[PDB]
Amino acid sequence: NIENGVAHIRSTFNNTIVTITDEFGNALSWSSAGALGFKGSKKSTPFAAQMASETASKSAMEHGLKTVEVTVKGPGPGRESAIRALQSAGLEVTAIRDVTPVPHNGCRPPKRRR
RNA sequence: GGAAAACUUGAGUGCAGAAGAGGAAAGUGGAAUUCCAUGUGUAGCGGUGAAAUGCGCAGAGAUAUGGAGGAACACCAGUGG
């Protein structure tokens, strides 16, 4: 089980959740990013993806996987403070992938915020 | 003004080629919001200028080889055509 996997996050503008999994997704543990008492304008922190990143990473305890190769699929304030700060656990982050959804003009997008 | 002609610039009928988002018809595939299901797990997830309604204990989202739908299809994109 150990030494391989994907630290599958999707770092949104609020509540960048972290789900560690394998290289074929099975989600050994995940972490809700509001687990540090972040409720309103608070999960958009560096620290929502610093310690709640390792509230499932340091508390993995199931595979003991060490090579993580974290993957991000969205923009957020805790994005650069997620891939750095999943390695706040010190879990040898190796291969970050910017495989984000880029639709070739996918649908009809919503309205401007006045 | 009418009567008898011509020339071709102006226009049309020729010939050699350039380009395309020009209108009506057939294909190839991507990515996304929504759903139902696996794995997964349990405290929050979403939304907030400020919090909350809500959606959460059914697993809500999550997460990938991979299951689908609606609809269009960034890149070539321009005082371009």
Q: How far is CA A14 from CA A2, A25, A35, A62, A64, in A?
A: 31, 23, 13, 28, 29
CA distance A31 to A67: 19
Q: Which chain A residues 59-88 have CB under 7 A to strand B?
A: 71, 73
**Residue A112, CB, strand B, below 7 Å:** no
DSSP summary character for residue A97: B
Torsion of CA A40, A20, A100, A76, to 10 degrees: 20
- The reply to whether A40 has its C-beta less than 7 Å from any atom of strand B is yes
Q: Give the DSSP letter of residue A111.
A: -
Is there contact between A35 and strand B, defined as CB under 7 Å from any strand atom?
yes
Within 13 Å of residue A93, how many CA atoms lie on the same side as its CB?
23
- Asked how this structure was determined, the answer is cryo-EM
Look at the alpha carbons of A61, A59, A86, A79 in this order and tell me if their dihedral is positive or negative: positive
Indicate if CB(A102) is under 7 A from strand B.
Answer: yes
Listed resolution, Å: 2.4
DSSP 3-state of A20: strand
CA A10 from chain centre, in angstroms, equals 5
Round to whole Å and give the CA distance between A3 and A15.
Answer: 27
Taking the CA of residue A32 and the C1' sugar atom of nucleotide B58, their distance in angstroms comes to 19
